[model samples]
Target chain A: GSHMTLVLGGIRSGKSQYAEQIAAGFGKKILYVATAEVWPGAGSMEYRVRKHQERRPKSWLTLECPRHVASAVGESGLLDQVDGVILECVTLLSSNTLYAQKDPTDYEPFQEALIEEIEALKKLIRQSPVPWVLVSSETGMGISQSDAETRHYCDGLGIANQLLAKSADEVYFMVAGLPLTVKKG
Target chain B: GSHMTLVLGGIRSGKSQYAEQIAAGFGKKILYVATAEVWPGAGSMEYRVRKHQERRPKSWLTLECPRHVASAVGESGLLDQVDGVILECVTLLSSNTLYAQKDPTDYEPFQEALIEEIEALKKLIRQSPVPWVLVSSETGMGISQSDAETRHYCDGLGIANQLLAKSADEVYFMVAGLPLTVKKG
Candidate 1:
């Protein structure tokens, strides 16, 4: 059996970097699943690119799938080579993997797809030989006055973050470059 | 009954200049809402953006409603002096509003129906009889990304901007050290 951990933080809150540190400290070959779609001037995208470039071990092979991260993990031939895999986010993956119906108001099917994605990820984690460290953003911090679409995204991220944290052996919130452990290993 | 403000920025970084110019020295019954959402861009750090607009007159009232500023100052009828609203963002407004959805996976459900809410914002703001300074980006700023959902969103926002600006007294986009006023004051 393997353990799962979820790291949550605000953006550029040094969460991803901190997550990498934990992964490296574990002394495991890392499997990184990157979901970001690169845009030249995008601050977040650049940070992610540099993040990997700066600290990624030469041996830590990467799978650059924006969607189907769990599937990529399941099929990675080098699972044996890596002791851990970090799927850095769920929002981006969910954005890519989930489909919308003909009528935008019909959410039942979309909800089911989301639940299924979560289940699939859980299944992958259950069967994986390597430990999994997940990093997701808790976007609900500060200021609740926006519009419907943005509120929905934050609410969903918060729920997804909550669900993943509940199932993790260890959970953390990164703020001001420091980790406040929410769950103990 | 409520008040609102809109601030505009550019992927071009000239947004601060326009925001400052629009907000410069005009003292009155002003309600300034600092609408900002912190999310990572690929390489885009938010430092410059934050600093760019923070040079507001110290006496300006500020609210951080990156999510639901429109509704918070619900119906603007009670508002006095047509309180000039410096929203500081429509993009963050879009993002925060979308993120707040309880089930954001159903993007289709949010399609046109969701836009009605933003469209209705004109009525809400106009009720104040206040001259509003609304800011949004031009869609042509970059080669639109290959992402289907994002592209769809951008397209819709293009329409939204057209309508919102049509209702506005002024529309402008700052580029290459010049302000091209799209509308007459």
Candidate 2:
């Protein structure tokens, strides 16, 4: 298995900053996938996103395919030169899944899609010639919500995070920009 | 925690074997708590269960406290008598909870009972003068269930296992009679 890291923490936990610093330190050309599609509505939340962009190297080839990120990685022809592929945020990817799962009857199909997508992503990382840094929020923490739709979204996102964390070679929980490494390759 | 060891695996994944073996090597009196009730048609299952009993020394004191094993442990005063206490299978405890949850309304009550049971046992173990080995099965390895009830049970069981494993001083994943130690105290 290739080296893959899953950076996890709550919102404003500096996970992206730590991930970007580590990714930059890798000294390899980066394939960055900006998974967020809610930029326009992110009024107060865009500060972290802005800092992330400023810190990211301009020469790095950035990909914004929140809906079809796995496909981009699956179809990328830069295998020989691509140093790494970073999935920026799993939270947005989960929102994309929920949007695709609008029909209530489409629950099982959506879950299957999630499992298959994660398995595919894990397989791609396993087969990659270079390393990868995956960024995801700790969706299980914080206050509980009684709202049915929000709770449902949180549950699905948590399951998605579980699958990715389980398959990752290394797992880091970032807090106040400090990384407490919980697992190692 | 008092020398806690987490023995986890899939159903019939040899968790009990590893727990028993570890107990035998501890060179002290072993107390085995059986959490499953014996019924008329459970003969074959009893035979298989008895096989596990035959593996240990004849002097081993066994207690069958299906539903309220926690109370039995508390009342028996075995915490002061035995050098070790082994909770054979958490999956069975969860199954009992599910059985009692035939009415979805009973879910909250069941969770209260469960949390109380585990918390009491955890407190006792933390203060006990000897080591404790907790055994649980990994039930979330496969596909999500087709029904909400089963899915909820799986989710609760996963949460239970997660809490115990994190609290345990050491954790082991047994596969096909082999143990892969995952955590160190």
Candidate 3:
């Protein structure tokens, strides 16, 4: 029996670790789809990315996909080899898609692309041959205290989270390393 | 039969609405302790404060408190009359407390005061004669993308939420106008 779960939380709230535990339950050969782009000289991001990587089992296949994650999954033909799949983040996927917009000031367009990305990922998860765990951050909580660009990002990610939460077999909102179930399949 | 609940959510995530519902369950004579400071010329803030104030029932007692909210609650002598209390937010409480500091750059002192405020509020809630619903925003969710000052604010408020959550009889994390149970008595 296959299932899909969406794990949402704040930074350092242990979302990844919780997601990892869920993914680990799916068995040994796991598909690790990482949406984070490791840009050079971005020390903090670099540190985080490295930390997550080191936390993973060397045996799992890792896909460093920035966007169009489902397309990568299909093209790589790695789906047949893994027992389960864990997508590292929806936050960065939305980020990459939003930044790709030529005019971020016109937020509607970026949001459109974000919705499309979420739809694609959702479709893939529904059809997946194995269990799935999606990780993302909660952005809507702090949008009021942010800049225009940051608000736009929050708008995109927050809506993305809501959409995902609607379809996931289960949903967990993490707080200070604890996972609270929002939706139960 | 008194209980304390911490309602946490993102901006416009329906935290206040949920908290209000909880307080309304208590009784007609509700103690509305508003921590938001409505300042002149801050249009958005003004609009929100007005919206919340208007949302309240005329029978409920409103206290226009920016800080030292527990002290106000104690001094008002309304505790004996009210059936329950709903404090609007922890976000603004930390923000006001942070800005009140002469050296916000030196975050340690600001944090020290923040802990004390949270402690005082906690003590009041513990000894409250009625049900208490404390509303607050989750800061850590969006801190990774925030500025230095914003991060400090997040640190202060995030830790505050954690402390309150630990002591709360129940906690609800709101999302897209829906309430999700995070903790239960």
Candidate number with greatest DockQ: 3
TM-score of 2: 0.57
* DockQ values per model: 0.02, 0.02, 0.23
Evaluated on CA atoms against the true complex, candidate 3 attains a DockQ of: 0.23
**Candidate 3 per-residue lDDT over residues B1-185, each given as its tens digit:** 43999999886466877799899999999999888777777334787577777877988999878888889898888889999999887888998999999977777988999999999989988887888999998755443544567768878888999999999999988864467878996
Tens digit per residue, CA lDDT, model 3, A1-185: 33989898877899998999999999998999998888876444888778877877988989989989988997888888999999988988988988899977667899899899889988988888888999998767653543566777876787788788778888888889999877785
- DockQ-based class of model 3: acceptable
Candidate 2 lDDT over residue span B16-100, tens digit each: 8888887776557888888876566745368767777787677777887766667788788877788787887777777676676
**Per-residue lDDT tens digits of candidate 1, residues A1-185?**
22888877543345676778777765557888787767666334676488666767897878887765667767766567887888867767655543333432344544556566677788887777777888876555444434544444455556666767777888876532346667875
State the TM-score of the second chain for every model: 0.73, 0.88, 0.94
> Which regions in candidate 2 have their CA more than 4 angstroms from the true location?
A1-4, A7-66, A69-185, B42-44, B102-107
What is the DockQ (computed on Cα atoms) for candidate 2?
0.02
- For each candidate in turn, give its C-alpha RMSD to the true structure in angstroms: 17.8, 11.2, 6.4
lDDT of 2 at B150: 62
Name the top lDDT candidate: 3
Clashing pairs in 2: none
**TM-score of predicted model 3?**
0.61
Ranked by DockQ, the better of candidates 1 and 3 is: 3
